């Protein structure tokens, strides 16, 4: 487990929530 399992998505929370 990272911090909540599956933290960063891949585009949004993945690209860091798309630069907030």
Count of Cβ atoms closer than 10 Å to residue 18 Cβ: 10
Neighbours of 8 (CB within 10 A): 13
Experimental technique used? Answer: NMR
CA angle 11, 18, 13 (to 5 degrees): 55
Give me 8's structure tokens: 């960063």
CA atoms within 13 A on the CB side of 10: 0
- Rounded CA separation 9/2 (Å): 13
């Amino acid at each position: 487990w990272l911090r909540r399992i599956g933290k960063g998505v891949k585009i949004i929370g993945g690209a860091a929530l798309d630069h907030l």
